[PDB]
Design a protein around this ligand. Structure first.
Ligand SMILES: CCCCCCCCCCCCCCCC(=O)O
Ligand SMILES: CCCCCCCCCCCCCCCC(=O)O
Lengths: 268, 121, 255, 238, 57, 268, 57, 60, 125, 60, 57, 59
C-alpha cells in the first residue's frame, strides 16, 4: 500500500531537509511535509499494476507471414527473434537481463485468391506448425520426411476452432536472457558484433496439411508472445530514437525532445 | 526500393518526386507542405535498406498556429478545436446586442491567418 | 574530530587520498566478492593473485576544453595491456572481477563546469551506416580514450561508430543514464568522483577479451569556463583498481 | 459424461487473460538462478531516481547539451523570471522524455507528489538567491514575482550545499490525474524568479548555469496499462 | 490439493486454484507479488545520509 | 419481507393520524388501519426485484456500427459513451452519482453484399476488437502497426463461436460516476459545458483480420453493457421529454401528461 | 473453498459458489441485498414527528 | 481428459444471466469509496415520497 | 554532524533557507502567541485563518548604492494590500499579530559593507 | 448443466502432451512381466560406456 | 480419491491427479521416474576393481 | 540430481587412478579431480529429460 502523508506544523530549527548535494548521486528522500505544513491523510492507493509482471504480462504480436496451397511458397518459416516488432522490443529493453517463461499463441486465417477456376467447393483446411531446434533437419520442401515430427514438437489446428496455445519454459544456456551484448562472436574481436551473436532460438515452420480446394487459397499465421514468471535486473533508459534493424541497435540521430517557443512558455 | 512512404505533414523534395529507380543505400529528403513548420529534433531523411524497404518515417512537420483570436467587445468567442491550422472559431453576442458568425484559420501567403475579421456587436 | 570531505583508499601497494570528495557510490548496493561453490560452473581450481592484480592503475590524462563533448573507456580493454592484470587475463580463458573507478579533476574557485561520471553495463553501440556494424578499432580504444562528437557522424560505406553526445552512441537519452551508478564533479563542490562496481553479468565467468562488461562515460554537462588570466589547461585523470579478481582455464598466451 | 453448459466468451482470445496451458517441452530442466546485482521488482523503483530535465528546449537547443542548461546571469534589475512550465509530466514536452515521463506514457492515471532538485553549476565565488514557486490552477500563470510569491514557494540560498529540492505536493480534487492533456485535470504552473541579484567578484565569470532533476515521491502511483505514443513502425524490421 | 487466496478488491472475497499439469511452467502468472526495495537505485552511497543533516559537512 | 397489516377497531379518541401538514415536506407514515377498521393478515410479498442491482443488472445494446472487407471503410471506431441509446440512459439517469462494474458483450454478424464477381468461395472470418485508452496511438489505417496490442487490450473472435464477453472494473478518476455535471471545462466559466467535460473513456476499434473472400462482405458489431456491483446516490425525476443529443441534455418542451375530457372523467 | 447459500424460493434449497478469477470484479452480481432505509427521503426533518399528534401545535 | 457432456442452452447469450467472466484489466486498483449523502438501496424508497398529481389535465 | 550557519523556517506553504546566518533574535525574549481569556476585552468570537495569513510575503527589492542613506517600512501598512492578510484586516475592525522579519543581501568575498536591521516600536516621526 | 468456459488451445493436437484417453480394448489382460537382464532406465547409462573413436578418418 | 504430487521446478508447487477410466492403460505417462544403475553396462566384471589400485597386479 | 564435483589438492602418492587396463572391458570410473586440482561446486543439473519415457514418449 502506498505511504500515507504525515501532519506537520511550523518550524524554525537548524534542520535543513531541502538543502542537499546531488554531486553524491543520492536521491533526496524528502516528503512534502518537510517544506510546508501538511495534514494527515491515510493513502489507500496501491502499486499493484506497476509490478514487473503486470507490466510485461500481455500478449503481443511479434511476427506474421503468409503461405499458399499452390504455386511456389507452399510453406512458411521464421527464425525465432523478439526484435521483429517495436512495441514488445521496447518494453523488454527496459532491463539488461530478464528471465521469463513464454506463453505462445497462434492465429491462422485463410483467404480465397482471385482466379478463373469454376466449380469451387472447398473443404476444411488443417494446418501444421513444426518447431525445429538449432541443428535439426530443416524442411527443404513441403512434402519433406522431416514433417514426421518424432522428437520435434508440432501442433495441428483445424480452421473454425479456438486458436492454438502452448507454454514454453525458460530456454537458455545462460542464467538469464540478454537484451544487450557488448562483444564479438570470435575471441579475436572480429566477426558478428552485438546481441545477434547470443541469439540461437532455432526456426519455426508452417504448412497446409491438405490442398482443400481446386482454387488458390492463401493463409497467414500470427505469432503472439506473453511473458510470465518474469524476473529482471539492471534497468536502463528507454529507446529515444526509432529502431531500424532487428540484428543490431543501429539508429539515426534524433533530438532529446520537442521544441517550444521560449523558456517561459506554458504551452507546447 | 519502391516509392518513399507518403506522410501527411511533409512532401518529397525536388527532384526525388520525378524519380522511379532507387538503389540500395539511397537517401531521400522531405520538406514541410503548407502551412506545416519543420520540427528541429527530427531529421527529414529516409534510406533504402538492404531488404529493399525504406527506414522508419515519422511526421517531420507540425501544423502552424494561427494568432490569438482576440477579444470581441460585447461578444463571446467559441474555440472548440484550438487555434491550429484548419480550426474554426465562432463569434456570438450577448443578450441585448445585435451582431461574421465564424472564422477559419487558413494559409494566406507564408503564414496562417484567420479568414473573416472580428464582427461588430 | 572528523570531517566527511576527506577519504583514503588502500589497495595492494597503492593508496588514493582526497580532500574534497562526495560520498562513495557502491554499485547496486553490492560489494564485490569472490565466487561461491553453490554458484560456480567451471571445475578446475582458480588462481587469485590478490595483490598485483588488485591495485590502482592510472591511465592517461585528457584535456578538458571549452568545447569537449566527452570520453568513454571499456574497462576490460583499458587494463588489457597494463601490469600483471593484462598478463593474467591474457593466458587465462575465463575471468571474473569488480572494478572501482576514481576520476579526478583539479581547478580553482574561479573555474566553473560539471561532469557526469557514469558506469554503463553492456554499452552496445551503433554505426553511422544503418546497414553494417562498427569496427573493433572504432569501438575499443586501448591505452587511450575515445571521444564523442558534437555533430552527427555522416553515413556512407563506412564502419564508423555514431558518436553523437546527446544519443551516447546507444540512441537513448544522456539525462536518463543516471539509472546506472553515477556521480558528478561540480568544480565548485568536489575535486573527484569514486564509484565501486561489482561483477555484473548473466553468466558466472566470461572471457575478458571478446566481451566488455561495463563502460565508463565522462560527459561534461556544463562547459568549462574561466576569465582570461587563469589556467587554460585542465586535465582529467582516471584510476581503475580491479577487485576480487579470479581466473580459470590456463592456456597458451593470446595476443 | 458430466453434463456441462458453455457460457458466452468461449473459444475467444483475450490478450490480457490468465490461464494454464500444456507445456510444449515436458520435464525440461532450467538453469539454476544466480545472484545478479540490481533486481527490479516494481516500476516505481525506476521512477524515484533523478533524471535531468531538458528545460531549455527552444529551437535547435534540443540537438545538443544546451537543452539541459538554465542560463542565469547577473543583471541591472530584480524580480525577473528564469523559467516556467506546467505540471504535466505525461503531456508537457519538458517532462515527456524524462524517466518519469517515459514510465508515465505507458499508463493512463497518475497520482502523487513531484520532487524537483536544482543544482548550481557556477563558480565557487558566485552567490545568489532564487524563488521557486508552484501555483495551483484557477488563475493563469503568474506574470510577476508578487503573484508567484502567493503560491507554494521555497527561497533557495546558494552556498556550500549547491542543491535545493522543491517538493510539488498533491493538491488535486481528483484522486488520479490524466496523463494525456485534459483541461478538467489541470495541474498548475512552476516558475522561478531572481530573489536578489547574482553577486560575482572581479575576474570571475558572471554567467552561470543551473541544472534540474525530477523524481517521483513515495506516494506516487499509476493505474492503467496502455501503449506509448512515441514508439512507431512502417514494416517488420530486417 | 487446492489453494485458497484473497482476490484484488477495493479499499475503504477469496478464490480457489488447482494445478492440472506437472511442469510448473504451465501455471498462471504471478500477479500478486507486491514487494519493493528502492534502496539500490535511490541512495546507493556507502556512508549513510540523514535527511536533516547537511550532506557535506 | 413486506410489512404485514395490523387489525384495529373503532375509535373515538383525540388522536388525529390523518390530519398533518405537508408544508414540512415530511411524508405521512399512515397505514390503512388508522382511518378504518382492518383485519390482521400476514404479508409474504417481497421487494427482491426492486433492488438497485436487479433494476440495472440487464444487458442493453448501446451502439452498433458496420465495417467491410474492401472499399473505403475497412475498420470501425466508437468513442465510449452510454448516452448513445435511450433506454439504458434513462434507466441510469434515475440517480445523480452511480458506481458500478461493467460486463461487456460483443455480437458480430456478417453479410454478403451484391456484386458481380463469379466463383465466390469464402473462408471463415476472424475479427479483432482493440480498445485504446485516451492518449494512445489510434489506428490511422487498417494495416496500422498499432494493432500489435502489446500494452493495449484486444479480443479475437472467429465467426460461428459464442459471442465474446469480458469484465471491466470501476474505471474513474473520481469516487463515483457522474450522470450530470453543472460546470465548464475551463475555470473561467467558458468552453465545453455539461457532462461532456467529465467524459474521457477512450475509443474502441474493430477490423477484419482477413479478407476471407474475393467478394464484398459487410460486418456489423453490437456493444452490450450489463452493470453489476451497482451502488447509487441522490435519486432524481425521470426524463419527461424525449432526448435529442448525446453530449447534452437539450430538449424540446412537452406537456406534463396527456389530456382527458374533464376533471370528472374515469376514462383516458 | 466454496460458499453455500440459500436460493430464492416461494413462501407459504441451497446453492454452491466458487470464484475462479482473482480480480473481484469478475464475480457474479449481488442479487440478494435486501436492505432498506427510507428515512432519508421520507421524514428528513430535524424534529421528530409523532403520527397521532398534531404536526403544528 | 475429464469426460463431459454439453446440454442444450450452450454458447447462447441470455441477457438476464449471471456468470463470471475474465477481467480485461487485471490487478486494477479502484478509487476507495467515500461517504455520499442519500444512498438508494431499493426503488420502493423512491416510490414512498410524495409527488404532486396533475389532476386537472384538461385541454391546454 | 551539524553546523549553526544553516537555518530553515517553515510557515504556511512557504519556506526560507539560509547558508550563512547569525543567530535568530526573538523580540524581547517573548514568542508570539494568541490572546488569553483573562486578558481579552472584546466579546465576539475571533477568526483565526492561521494558514493563508501566516505565510511569507516578499515585498519589492531596493538597490544598495555607494551613497544610499537607508530605507524604512511600516509593517501594518506594507502588507495592507498583499494577500488574504490585506483582505482580513480590511473587513475587520480589530486585529492582533506578531511579525517575523527576514532581510537578505547577496554579495561576494570582494565586496564590503554593513547594514543595521532594526525593529522600532511606535516610530513617531 | 454446470456452466463452463473454453479457453484457447481447445480441440488442438500438440504432439508432446499428456492426457488420459479411453481404452479401445477394455479389461484386456496383459502378459505378466519377467526378469530380463540389462534393463535401461536412463539414456546416460548408455553414454557412460566406452566407444572406439574413429580418429584417422582421412580419405578412404 | 485424488493424488497430490510435486511438479518439475527449477533449483536454486504441487499438482492434483484423478483417474477417470478403469483400465490402467489409459492413465498419463510416467515422466518422473529418475532412477539409475549403470553398473550393469559400466563395470560388468566379476572381481571388483578399485580405482586407485593397478588393474592387473 | 547429477553428482557434484569434489575439491582436491596436489598429490605425490602411489595411487595410479589414471593408469588402467581396458582389456577387461571395465569403463574407468575416474573423475576430473583425480588428474588435476579441482574446486568444490554443487551441481544442480538433472537427468530428467534423458529417461527412457521422456525419450520415446512423443507422437
Ligand atoms: C509447437 C510449436 C512450438 C514452438 C516453440 C517456440 C519456442 C520459442 C522460444 C523463444 C524464447 C524466447 C527468446 C528470447 C530471445 C532473447 O531475448 O534472447
Ligand atoms: C477487449 C475490449 C475491451 C473494451 C473495454 C471497454 C471499456 C469501456 C468502459 C466504460 C465504463 C463506463 C463508462 C461510464 C461513463 C459515465 O457514465 O460517465
Amino acid at each position: 500500500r502506498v505511504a500515507d502523508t504525515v501532519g506537520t506544523g511550523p518550524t524554525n530549527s537548524e534542520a535543513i531537509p531541502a538543502l542537499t548535494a546531488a554531486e553524491t548521486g543520492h536521491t533526496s528522500q524528502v516528503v512534502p511535509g518537510d517544506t510546508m505544513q501538511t495534514r494527515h491523510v491515510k493513502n489507500y492507493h496501491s502499486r499493484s499494476e506497476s509490478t514487473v509482471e503486470n507490466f510485461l504480462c500481455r500478449s503481443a504480436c511479434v511476427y506474421f507471414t503468409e503461405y499458399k496451397n499452390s504455386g511456389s511458397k507452399r510453406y512458411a518459416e521464421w527464425v525465432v527473434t523478439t526484435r521483429q516488432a517495436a512495441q514488445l522490443r521496447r518494453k523488454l529493453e527496459f532491463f539488461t537481463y530478464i528471465r521469463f517463461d513464454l506463453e505462445l499463441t497462434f492465429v491462422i486465417t485463410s483467404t480465397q485468391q482471385p482466379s478463373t477456376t469454376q466449380n469451387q467447393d472447398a473443404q476444411i483446411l488443417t494446418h501444421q506448425i513444426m518447431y525445429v531446434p538449432p541443428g535439426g533437419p530443416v524442411p527443404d520442401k513441403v512434402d519433406s520426411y522431416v514433417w514426421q515430427t518424432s522428437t520435434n514438437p508440432s501442433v495441428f489446428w483445424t480452421e473454425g476452432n479456438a486458436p492454438p496455445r502452448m507454454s514454453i519454459p525458460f530456454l537458455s544456456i545462460g542464467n538469464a536472457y540478454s537484451n544487450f551484448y557488448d562483444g564479438w562472436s570470435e575471441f579475436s574481436r572480429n566477426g558478428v558484433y552485438g546481441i545477434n551473436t547470443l541469439n540461437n532460438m532455432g526456426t519455426l515452420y508452417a504448412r497446409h496439411v491438405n490442398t482443400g480446394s481446386t482454387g488458390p487459397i492463401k493463409s497467414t499465421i500470427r505469432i503472439y508472445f506473453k511473458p510470465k514468471h518474469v524476473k529482471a535486473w539492471i534497468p536502463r533508459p528507454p529507446r529515444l530514437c526509432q529502431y531500424e534493424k532487428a540484428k543490431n541497435v543501429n539508429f539515426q540521430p534524433s533530438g532529446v525532445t520537442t521544441t517550444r517557443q521560449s523558456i517561459t512558455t506554458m504551452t507546447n | 526500393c519502391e516509392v518513399p512512404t507518403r506522410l501527411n505533414s511533409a512532401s518529397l523534395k525536388q527532384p526525388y518526386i520525378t524519380q522511379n529507380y532507387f538503389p540500395v543505400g539511397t537517401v531521400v529528403e522531405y520538406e514541410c507542405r503548407p502551412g506545416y513548420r519543420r520540427e528541429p529534433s527530427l531529421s527529414p531523411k529516409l534510406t533504402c535498406l538492404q531488404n529493399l524497404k525504406w527506414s522508419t518515417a515519422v511526421e517531420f512537420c507540425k501544423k502552424k498556429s494561427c494568432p490569438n483570436p482576440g477579444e470581441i467587445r460585447n461578444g463571446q468567442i467559441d474555440v472548440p478545436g484550438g487555434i491550429l491550422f484548419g480550426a474554426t472559431i465562432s463569434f456570438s453576442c450577448n443578450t441585448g446586442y445585435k451582431l461574421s458568425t465564424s472564422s477559419f484559420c487558413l494559409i494566406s501567403g507564408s503564414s496562417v491567418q484567420w479568414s473573416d475579421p472580428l464582427p461588430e456587436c | 574530530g572528523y570531517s566527511d570531505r576527506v577519504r583514503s583508499i588502500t589497495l595492494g601497494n597503492s593508496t588514493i587520498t582526497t580532500q574534497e570528495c562526495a560520498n562513495v557510490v557502491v554499485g547496486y548496493g553490492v560489494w564485490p566478492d569472490y565466487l561461491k561453490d553453490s554458484e560456480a560452473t567451471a571445475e578446475d581450481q582458480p588462481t587469485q593473485p590478490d595483490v598485483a592484480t588488485c591495485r590502482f592503475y592510472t591511465l592517461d590524462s585528457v584535456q578538458w576544453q571549452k568545447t569537449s563533448p566527452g570520453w568513454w573507456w571499456k574497462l576490460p580493454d583499458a587494463l588489457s595491456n597494463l601490469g600483471l592484470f593484462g598478463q593474467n587475463m591474457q593466458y587465462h580463458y575465463l575471468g571474473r572481477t569488480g572494478y572501482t573507478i576514481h576520476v579526478q579533476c583539479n581547478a580553482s574557485k574561479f573555474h566553473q563546469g560539471c561532469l557526469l561520471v557514469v558506469c554503463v553495463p553492456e554499452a552496445e553501440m551503433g554505426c553511422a551506416t544503418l546497414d553494417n556494424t562498427p569496427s573493433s578499432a572504432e569501438l575499443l580504444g586501448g591505452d587511450a580514450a575515445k571521444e564523442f562528437a558534437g555533430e552527427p557522424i555522416a553515413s556512407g560505406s563506412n564502419k564508423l561508430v555514431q558518436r553523437v553526445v546527446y544519443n551516447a552512441g546507444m540512441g537513448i537519452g544522456v539525462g536518463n543514464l543516471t539509472i546506472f551508478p553515477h556521480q558528478w564533479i561540480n568544480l565548485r563542490t568536489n575535486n573527484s568522483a569514486t564509484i565501486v562496481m561489482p561483477y555484473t553479468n548473466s553468466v558466472p565467468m566470461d572471457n575478458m577479451f571478446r566481451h566488455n562488461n561495463i563502460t565508463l562515460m565522462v560527459i561534461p554537462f556544463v562547459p568549462l569556463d574561466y576569465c582570461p588570466g587563469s589556467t587554460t589547461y585542465v586535465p582529467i585523470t582516471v584510476t581503475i583498481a580491479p577487485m576480487c579478481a579470479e581466473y580459470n582455464g590456463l592456456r597458451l598466451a593470446s595476443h | 459424461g458430466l453434463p456441462t453448459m458453455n457460457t458466452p466468451g468461449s473459444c475467444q482470445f483475450l490478450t490480457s487473460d490468465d490461464f494454464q496451458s500444456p507445456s510444449a517441452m515436458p520435464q525440461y530442466d532450467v538453469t539454476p538462478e544466480m545472484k545478479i546485482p540490481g533486481e527490479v521488482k516494481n516500476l516505481m523503483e525506476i521512477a524515484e531516481v533523478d533524471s535531468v530535465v531538458p528545460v531549455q528546449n527552444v529551437g535547435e537547443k534540443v540537438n545538443s547539451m544546451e537543452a539541459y542548461q538554465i542560463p542565469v546571469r547577473s543583471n541591472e534589475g530584480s524580480g525577473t523570471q528564469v523559467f516556467g512550465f506546467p505540471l504535466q509530466p505525461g503531456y508537457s514536452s519538458v517532462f515527456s522524455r524524462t524517466l518519469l515521463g517515459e514510465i508515465l506514457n505507458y499508463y493512463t492515471h497518475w497520482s502523487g507528489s513531484i520532487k524537483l532538485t536544482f543544482m548550481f553549476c557556477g563558480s565557487a565565488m558566485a552567490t545568489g538567491k532564487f524563488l521557486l514557486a508552484y501555483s495551483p490552477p484557477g488563475a493563469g500563470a503568474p506574470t510577476k514575482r508578487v503573484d508567484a510569491m502567493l503560491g507554494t514557494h521555497v527561497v533557495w540560498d546558494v552556498g556550500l550545499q549547491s542543491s535545493c529540492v522543491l517538493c510539488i505536493p498533491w493538491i488535486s480534487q481528483t484522486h488520479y490525474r490524466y496523463v494525456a492533456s485534459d483541461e478538467y485535470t489541470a495541474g498548475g504552473f512552476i516558475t522561478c524568479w531572481y530573489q536578489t541579484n547574482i553577486v560575482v567578484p572581479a575576474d570571475a565569470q558572471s554567467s552561470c548555469y543551473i541544472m534540474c532533476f525530477v523524481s517521483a515521491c513515495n506516494d506516487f502511483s499509476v493505474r492503467l496499462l496502455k501503449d506509448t505514443p512515441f514508439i512507431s513502425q512502417n514494416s517488420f524490421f530486417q | 490439493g487446492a489453494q485458497v487466496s484473497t482476490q484484488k478488491t477495493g479499499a475503504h472475497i477469496h478464490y480457489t486454484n488447482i494445478n492440472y499439469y506437472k511442469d510448473a511452467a504451465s501455471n498462471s502468472a504471478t500477479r500478486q507479488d507486491f514487494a519493493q526495495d528502492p534502496g539500490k537505485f535511490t541512495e546507493p552511497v556507502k556512508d549513510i545520509m540523514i535527511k536533516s543533516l547537511p550532506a557535506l559537512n
